[PDB]
Nucleic acid binder design. Structure first.
Ligand SMILES: [Zn+2]
Lengths: 121, 384, 232, 238, 148
RNA sequence: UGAGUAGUGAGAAA
RNA sequence: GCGAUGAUCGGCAGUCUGACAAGU
């Protein structure tokens, strides 16, 4: 019913943000709504993360429209300041994207989180 | 023990009577099943007693929802009332078990049946379609399904005309057509009246103004001080054309043309006035529509510019989907957004992008965010 | 120009009104009749009571009514309705003036070149005069150029490539050419073009021409006799 | 491969309404009901015919589970010109628009979909194509939309649901004609991920037999897709 | 149109990588005697043989044979109706069980065939990757199931 | 007479 | 008193021919 949906819980958000920090270290993270849009256009995004406290929320609702069209999992986190923190950027992030790479060193947990996100959807 | 059958079709409600009752123990036998497929055999089983077509599309959509939700419509209640005898209990065959309780509540004297035996007859009725009404006017069921279906589908989707943005796209594709077209006819008015007295084509370069003065000043000979005031009221005397036309009309080489020729010019000029008048009306409607659909975009850049961007993308949904860079190059052929100048254009394009997002994914968009967003551009503007 | 422009607006009205009721274009093909229906009935619900007799015959008007209830188009606001009606008001209006200009033009030809109107007609006579730019300019041209006046592209393409040249030009659409058949069309074009020159030089260069078209009349008679014997 | 300006030779496929475009590579194509546009960005082939410029659309096996099926060589396809078809799981016009191409103007496609957002584009596509009737409704309760549909010659189910068998039987029980067509797309992962694919397919075939659908054919869809088989059957009411 | 049936995706040369525990096994009519005759219980002679949970399956055709047998083989009939034994419906007219069994294994490579008929066993042997179960001596024996 | 109508993506200022 | 709600980078081109034609 709410526009931000599904919204990850306190437990689930941690593992998602865990993958986010690991991805940032390995240059496998795309930060910001504009970048996430580009990845969805290219079909190189494993899944998309959004912040449910975006002010206003609407300016990132185009990712959900893109996502299930391309059959890409997505999920919302309560906080953007927290999301920006894990991203490694000194500013809040309302949306980010995990780039697809089957040769990545952190593949396994990416699929683990992705499986849960699919279940939540 | 089935004596009456209820069938629901897009045109209306049909009620049938079971003339002959097929074998129940022998229901699974091939011949009785073949009888269902064969029209000739099927006719001997059942017969039409009544058909009540819906008054209009509204009733069909209302009843389809009621039929969908297992409810009895007023139209449905009527046709059963007229057909089913009061009666121990009359037996009715219905496709839906969910309707059965509703029918029983309205009519305690009818017992509904939806067993396989009923399903076989329902299957046959739907099978033969238009053939079984014996020529009674039910149109063609396939086309009625199309019209009913999309209304029913759009209903459960809550599709709203408010969200419709195709009207804007038509307005822009039309407005420029009028603007070019008004120019085309207006030029010709200048030529026709140009012979009778060319100089006004020079005096009032504005074509839209020119047609009115030709409509008022048909004959250059007619020159009075009161008429000078009347044409002076037209436009303003700041340009001084009101005095020039009176003087220059007295002294000119324009050869008088025939009354039929003059009749054409004023009527032909009257056409140019009408389209420009409508063009102004249509332009106002565009502005009103853009504020309604995309208040953020319209406020941020403007009603005309925002509409052009939407048409370029092909739909407001498309524009919101596009990335910021894509939006910037969308209007980079007509300079919609337009070194330091280039920075503003890229910056403005990004703001327009999120503004589209707010409008598109908002059931009732507001202009509160567009105002501050435009204000944010203004602070960025003054900085450079 | 008006013919071109009324078409484009008609297309827009068909598309825009097609949104509220797409089935109309297939049923009624006339653009003017298409606009009038919008004026008589604005919304499909209004179709049930409205009468389209004066615009449409019996069989056509009932099909649009049946389409209206089973239609696909979506409902539109009165604000949308008002402006599309304004277009429909424009569409019908252009046709009214377009007919007026046709009558105004024909009267102009029957006074400035009565003989040609008798022989070639009003419309084709106009295009001939317009192509040369003036009546005198056409009058000074030989009959051969008048025969192939409107076929320059085909003429010079044939001349450069050592291939057959055209034989009808703009005169092809004249009634007498249409009556002819087979190769007789080319012969009548030559005969008609020559007689057109004879009549044309009368209209342009006669100081005290009687506005009767008489020289056109026997000139027409001679070609008809040529057509009869040639066809026979 | 198949670049924009390349010239190809179009020839019919064994199944009516399906055509083959030849070249260095071969493209299996369908005639465009609404020429001049692509629905999901697919390549389009234009041919001049006396001259009218007829158009054709490429038909990607990696996008439509049906398409990979014909690439694999299904023996019988009930989908044919001038036939009524009931499409379940019409997420969008990616595959429906092509099924609309095969049936042609005479037939129609009853497109059923549940989730609202994909349905919107299905409505939008339905506008260009007169012969589709999209029905935004949950297939699990065919009672709701029995109003909109008569008989249908063939029922196609692309629904990815564990109880997909039940939906087919209920829909087939209502609108499928006797001796009608049944074509099902099965994904074992959605049905039962615990067991291997082959066990699942046997189970699905079994449920169809319980519902009076006689299976006629099944085909695995590799190399285009994993763990997918299309089962073709006939509805034998008696 | 020519037909070249596609070999099942469950097969790598001669090993079926799809048949795995718990196993699904089709019961042949003759199997019941040599089970009863040898005092070997159906469910658990399978578990002892395969060391797994086994799901016996009786089709209509094999079932249809059983009642046709008559009073002499009532014990076989009753064991066939043990609720642990699930039932498989058939949609082919013929009641010949051997043909029905051969078709089902041809269709899907997920069944073990429990039979002692030499003719049927040879036909199954020709079909690759079909584990063939039989009863001999004192208990059940499985030949083409290396996971054992 | 003959004769064709897919920008990049975390720096910047000091 | 900065930034992922995005820093930085006119030409082609020239206005056809001219005394025969149709019948016994
Ligand atoms: Zn069997």
């Amino acid at each position: 019913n709410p526009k931000a949906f599904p919204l990850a819980d306190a437990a689930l958000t941690q593992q998602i943000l865990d993958v986010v920090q690991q991805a940032a270290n390995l240059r496998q993270l795309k930060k910001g709504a504009n970048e996430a849009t580009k990845t969805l256009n290219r079909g190189i995004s494993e899944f998309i993360i959004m912040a449910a406290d975006c002010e206003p929320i609407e300016i990132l609702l185009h990712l959900p429209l893109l996502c299930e069209d391309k059959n890409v999992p997505y999920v919302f986190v309560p906080s953007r300041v927290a999301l920006g923190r894990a991203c490694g950027v000194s500013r809040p992030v309302i949306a980010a994207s995990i780039t697809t790479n089957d040769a990545s060193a952190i593949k396994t947990q990416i699929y683990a989180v992705k499986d849960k996100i699919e279940t939540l959807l | 023990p089935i004596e009456y059958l209820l069938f629901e079709e897009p045109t209306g409600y049909a009620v049938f009577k079971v003339k002959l009752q097929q074998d129940d123990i022998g229901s699974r036998l091939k011949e009785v099943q073949e009888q269902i497929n064969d029209f000739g055999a099927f006719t001997k089983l059942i017969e039409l007693v009544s058909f009540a077509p819906f008054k209009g599309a509204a009733e069909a959509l209302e009843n389809a929802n009621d039929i969908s939700e297992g409810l009895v419509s007023e139209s449905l209640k009527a046709i059963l009332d007229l057909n089913l005898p009061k009666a121990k209990n009359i037996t009715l065959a219905i496709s839906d078990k969910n309707l059965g309780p509703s029918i029983k509540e309205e009519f305690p004297y009818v017992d509904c049946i939806s067993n396989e035996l009923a399903q076989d007859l329902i299957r046959g009725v739907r099978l033969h379609g238009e053939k079984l009404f014996k020529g009674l006017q039910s149109g063609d069921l396939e086309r009625a399904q199309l019209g009913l279906g999309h209304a029913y589908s759009r209903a459960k989707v809550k599709f709203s005309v408010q969200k419709n943005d195709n009207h804007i796209i038509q307005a822009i594709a039309l407005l420029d057509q009028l603007d070019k077209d008004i120019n085309t006819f207006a030029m010709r008015v200048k030529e026709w009246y140009g012979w009778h007295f060319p100089e006004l084509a020079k005096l009032v370069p504005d074509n839209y103004t020119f047609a009115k003065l030709v409509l008022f000043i048909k004959d250059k000979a007619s020159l009075n001080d009161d008429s000078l005031h009347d044409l002076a009221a037209l436009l303003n005397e700041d340009s001084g054309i009101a005095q020039r036309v009176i003087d220059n009309a007295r002294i000119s080489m324009g050869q008088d043309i025939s009354e039929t020729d003059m009749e054409n010019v004023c009527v032909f000029a009257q056409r140019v006035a009408s389209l420009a008048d409508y063009r102004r009306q249509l332009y106002d409607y565009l502005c009103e529509k853009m504020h309604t659909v995309a208040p953020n975009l319209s406020e941020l850049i403007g009603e005309v510019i925002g509409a052009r961007l939407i048409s370029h993308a092909g739909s407001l949904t498309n524009l919101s989907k596009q990335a910021a860079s894509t939006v910037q190059i969308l209007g980079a052929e007509k300079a919609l957004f337009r070194k330091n100048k280039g920075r503003i254009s890229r910056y403005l394009a990004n703001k327009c992008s999120m503004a589209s997002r707010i409008d598109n994914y908002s059931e009732e968009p507001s202009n509160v965010f567009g105002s501050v967003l435009k204000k944010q551009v203004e602070q960025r503007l003054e900085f450079y | 120009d008006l013919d071109k422009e009324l078409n484009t607006y008609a297309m827009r009205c068909k598309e825009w009104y097609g949104w509220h009721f797409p089935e109309l274009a297939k049923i009624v093909t006339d653009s003017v009749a298409y606009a009038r229906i919008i004026l008589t009935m604005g919304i499909r619900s209004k179709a049930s009571e409205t009468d389209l007799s004066e615009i449409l015959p019996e069989e056509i008007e009932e099909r649009v009514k049946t389409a209206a209830e089973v239609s696909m188009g979506t409902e539109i606001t009165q604000t949308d309705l008002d402006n599309i009606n304004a277009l429909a008001e424009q569409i019908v209006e252009f046709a009214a003036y377009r007919e007026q200009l046709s009558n105004y033009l024909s009267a102009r030809m029957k006074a400035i070149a009565p003989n040609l109107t008798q022989l070639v007609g009003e419309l084709v006579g106009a295009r001939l005069i317009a192509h040369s730019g003036s009546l005198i300019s056409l009058a000074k041209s030989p009959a051969s150029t008048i025969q192939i006046l409107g076929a320059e592209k085909a003429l010079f393409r044939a001349l450069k490539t050592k291939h057959d040249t055209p034989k009808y030009g703009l005169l092809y659409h004249a009634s007498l050419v249409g009556q002819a058949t087979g190769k007789n069309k080319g012969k009548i074009a030559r005969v008609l073009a020559a007689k057109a020159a004879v009549s044309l030089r009368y209209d342009a260069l006669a100081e005290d021409r009687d506005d009767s078209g008489d020289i056109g009349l026997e000139s027409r008679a001679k070609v008809e006799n040529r057509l009869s014997q040639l066809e026979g | 491969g198949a670049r924009g300006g390349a010239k190809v030779v179009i020839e019919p496929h064994r199944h009516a309404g399906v055509y083959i475009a030849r070249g260095k590579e071969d493209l299996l194509v369908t005639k465009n009901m609404a020429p001049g546009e692509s629905v999901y960005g697919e390549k389009r082939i234009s041919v001049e015919e006396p001259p009218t410029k007829v158009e054709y659309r490429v038909w990607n096996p990696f996008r439509s589970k049906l398409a990979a099926g014909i690439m694999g060589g299904l023996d019988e396809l009930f989908i044919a010109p001038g036939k009524k078809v009931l499409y379940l799981g019409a997420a969008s016009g990616t595959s429906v628009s092509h099924v609309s191409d095969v049936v042609g103007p005479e037939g129609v496609v009853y497109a059923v979909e549940f989730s609202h957002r994909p349905g919107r584009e299905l409505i939008s596509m339905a506008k260009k194509r007169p012969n589709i009737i999209p029905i935004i409704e949950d297939a699990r309760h065919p009672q709701k939309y029995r109003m909109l549909i008569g008989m249908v010659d063939c029922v196609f189910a692309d629904v990815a649901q564990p109880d997909q068998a039940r939906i087919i039987a209920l829909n087939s029980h209502m609108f499928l004609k006797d001796q009608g067509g049944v074509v099902i797309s099965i994904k074992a992962n959605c049905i039962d991920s615990t067991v291997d694919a082959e066990t699942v397919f046997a189970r699905e075939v079994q449920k169809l037999r319980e519902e009076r659908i006689k299976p006629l054919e099944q085909l695995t869809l590799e190399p285009y897709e994993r763990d997918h088989c299309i089962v073709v059957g006939r509805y034998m009411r008696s | 149109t020519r037909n070249i049936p596609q070999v099942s995706s469950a097969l790598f040369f001669q090993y079926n990588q799809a048949i795995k525990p718990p196993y699904q096994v089709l019961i042949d009519t003759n199997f019941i005697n040599f089970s009863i005759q040898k005092k070997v219980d159906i469910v658990r002679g399978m578990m002892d043989c395969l060391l797994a949970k086994c799901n016996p399956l009786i089709t209509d055709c094999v079932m249809a044979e059983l009642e046709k047998l008559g009073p002499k083989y009532r014990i076989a009939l009753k064991l066939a109706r043990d609720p642990r034994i699930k039932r498989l419906s058939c949609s082919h007219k013929g009641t010949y069980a051997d043909d029905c069994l051969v078709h089902r294994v041809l269709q899907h490579k997920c069944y073990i065939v429990a039979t002692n008929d030499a003719g049927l066993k040879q036909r199954i042997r020709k079909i690759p990757g079909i584990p063939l179960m039989s009863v001999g001596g004192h208990a059940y024996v499985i030949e083409k199931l290396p996971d054992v």
